[PDB]
Ligand binder design. Structure first.
Ligand SMILES: *[C@@H]1O[C@H](CO)[C@@H](O[C@@H]2O[C@H](CO)[C@@H](O[C@@H]3O[C@H](CO)[C@@H](O)[C@H](O)[C@@H]3O)[C@H](O)[C@H]2NC(C)=O)[C@H](O)[C@H]1NC(C)=O
Ligand SMILES: CC(=O)N[C@@H]1[C@@H](O)[C@H](O)[C@@H](CO)O[C@H]1O
Ligand SMILES: *[C@@H]1O[C@H](CO)[C@@H](O)[C@H](O)[C@H]1NC(C)=O
Lengths: 354, 376
């Protein structure tokens, strides 16, 4: 039979939607068909997000794949928790209690703290914006006081030589451009770029003026799964799949493809347990208070969190709060030849060289 | 005539509701009154906040008075901006700009930064609560490089959490190992003594500490030097009990029966309750001149109308928004005036210290000048 799911995409997230579509084809099975209902909206607009969520809810969707941002994350978490509708997302993870949110993106805070320690930094700047949450800010401040670090933590998000940049890609360019412009000790700087897409396109087109640059990567192109994927992705018709026909894939797009794998696996597992996922009967007003307890929702959430598969972002496994666990983050440096992996980080071993 | 308004109150805002009711009596006249419809909600729950806001929208109110927190502020700003219904609030003011929001609460960050400079601090602990918000901490961290401040930031919002032992370890390392004696407390006003009590059991030579209470209600709770272990204590106050307007209010408020008016029968009023009373004055002054629309029937609201009904035409809603922002009155929180984004301007924050005889005003911070001025 067909299983209804929702898709909540930001306007302009073209590559991610192409990755979603490619995943829908790749992970298709004879057992059931995933029938997606797509909405494109401004995810920063909580009213619009509410409208889209309610639309999906009323179509009886069994799960929603989508994105949020700092302004709408609370709408998503509260509506998911209230209605027992699972939201699977490549957006920034959160540390709070968020039943019914499955976060495809691994937490970077631990790898970042381990890297600062690996380079033996004790004095540095953390230049950040709030677009990916403030948990990383809090974690840096916590560790600073513990290890006697002197940290200069500046919010660059509202603006009209060891440096961590945890900000929008546009701002990285502006900041580095400024350092090279000043012309003082340009090569003596060391930037750590606090995101999971070191080699994703744009970042390494920046002229760093010979400074040291380090970062992180969750998609390992040496992986058999990934190289095989890229072999096909790199030859797709860009007209048909905007953002495709590239040698690399943004990590958010890779997580979107992986999310389709996770959803498919969850529904396969529910089918194996004879848990009904065919079609919801009558869904009342979305904004009914109190909300009606939808029973299947709890099992669907459990099944999504129970999934274990290997994808483009490596080993995928979740804890009871929908957070990635048992993952690995590759630590990268920009060498004179190009970006190179210098080691990796996992929960159990922290940072391991080579 | 009468104008219908919404009132959205969090659980535990008992005194604020009493102040709202007292305001409705004070500012009503035989010629004009507000007719409120009160909903009581979990402000931390965005789904519940959405339901409440939308039900008021459905009923057809001129404005909604209410509260939000860190988790629900985006619901309020997005809904009032989309539906074009004005929301007037004593909650923490938002860092950015958002139409259809009237912020009764003056910004605190400016006065706090100025007070740190005034005392010539160069090193201090900043005890914050992440569930409360980090905007003020961020302002302090942003200024720390330029001002040469060594800040040790500790989330005491985790003092009872799973991060509890981590929180105590942090307090211990700063107070015992690093001998920190300057402490900023950025927290709920009624949590000050609980946090201080913990600090006192952890630190040493506590009589020598200097706390700044980063909150607009310095005297909202008991201030007993003995409770502070003999330390210096500084803070901020927007309700000035020397003001005739305020002392007259308190003369009346102090005899209201406490069962009937929870939180009243006191010699002080919480700054949030004062702002709630002032909000009734602002709405009254804004609305008394607006068009007397044809007397219609008021009916229970349906939250689903947020999706079923169109937004209030912008040209209609903006007239109410502008009327609110144009109000200039004196209230319990002093001079009330708004900029084009609904932020308080031209306000004054009193700077207080706990002295021998009790809390005393030692100076003030005006929004126009943005420095601490010392009083004789
Ligand atoms: C949880 O995480 C770890 C990755 O840290 C996964 O364990 C690893 O699994 C891979 C297979 O995907 C192992 O690599 C293989 O090793 C053998 C011999 O050691 C080699 O000849 C093969 O060609 C291949 O490279 C890796 O050794 C292993 N690592 C550890 C530390 O055990 C595990 O599968 C993940 N489990 C789940 C449920 O996600
Ligand atoms: C010349 C230069 O850029 N130096 C920086 C130094 O701060 C850093 O920690 C080191 C680590 O490999 O290289 C980089
Ligand atoms: C009131 O605010 C306006 C700015 O909008 C300014 O010109 C004036 O100085 C302020 N008045 C007082 C008394 O501070």
């Amino acid at each position: 039979n067909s299983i209804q799911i929702g898709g909540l995409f930001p306007r302009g997230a073209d590559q991610e939607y192409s990755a979603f579509r490619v995943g829908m084809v790749q992970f298709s099975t004879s057992e059931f068909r995933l029938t997606p209902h797509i909405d494109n909206l401004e995810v920063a607009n909580s009213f619009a997000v509410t409208n889209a969520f309610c639309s999906q809810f009323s179509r009886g969707v069994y799960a929603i794949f989508g994105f949020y941002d700092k302004k709408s994350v609370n709408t998503i978490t509260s509506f998911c928790g209230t209605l027992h509708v699972s939201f699977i997302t490549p957006s920034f993870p959160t540390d709070g209690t968020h039943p019914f949110v499955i976060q495809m993106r691994p937490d970077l805070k631990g790898a970042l703290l381990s890297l600062i320690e690996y380079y033996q930094w004790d004095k540095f700047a953390y230049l950040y914006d709030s677009d990916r949450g403030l948990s990383t800010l809090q974690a840096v401040l916590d560790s600073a006081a513990e290890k006697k670090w002197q940290v200069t933590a500046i919010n660059v998000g509202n603006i009209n030589r060891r440096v961590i940049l945890d900000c929008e890609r546009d701002k990285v360019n502006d900041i580095v451009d400024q350092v090279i412009t000043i012309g003082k000790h340009v090569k003596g700087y060391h930037y750590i770029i606090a995101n999971l897409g070191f080699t994703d396109g744009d970042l390494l087109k920046i002229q760093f003026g010979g400074a040291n640059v380090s970062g992180f990567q969750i998609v390992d192109y040496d992986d058999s799964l990934v190289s095989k994927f890229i072999e096909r992705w790199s030859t797709l018709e860009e007209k048909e799949y905007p953002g495709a026909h590239t040698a690399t894939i943004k990590y958010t797009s890779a997580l979107t493809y992986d999310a389709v794998q996770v959803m498919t696996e969850a529904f396969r597992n529910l089918r194996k347990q004879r848990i009904e996922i065919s079609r919801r009967g009558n869904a009342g007003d979305c904004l009914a208070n109190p909300a009606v307890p939808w029973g299947q929702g709890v099992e669907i959430e459990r099944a999504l969190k129970q999934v274990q598969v290997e994808g483009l972002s490596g080993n995928i496994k979740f804890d009871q709060n929908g957070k990635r666990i048992n993952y690995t983050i590759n630590i990268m440096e920009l060498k004179t030849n190009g970006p190179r992996k210098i080691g990796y980080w996992s929960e159990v071993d922290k940072m391991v060289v080579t």
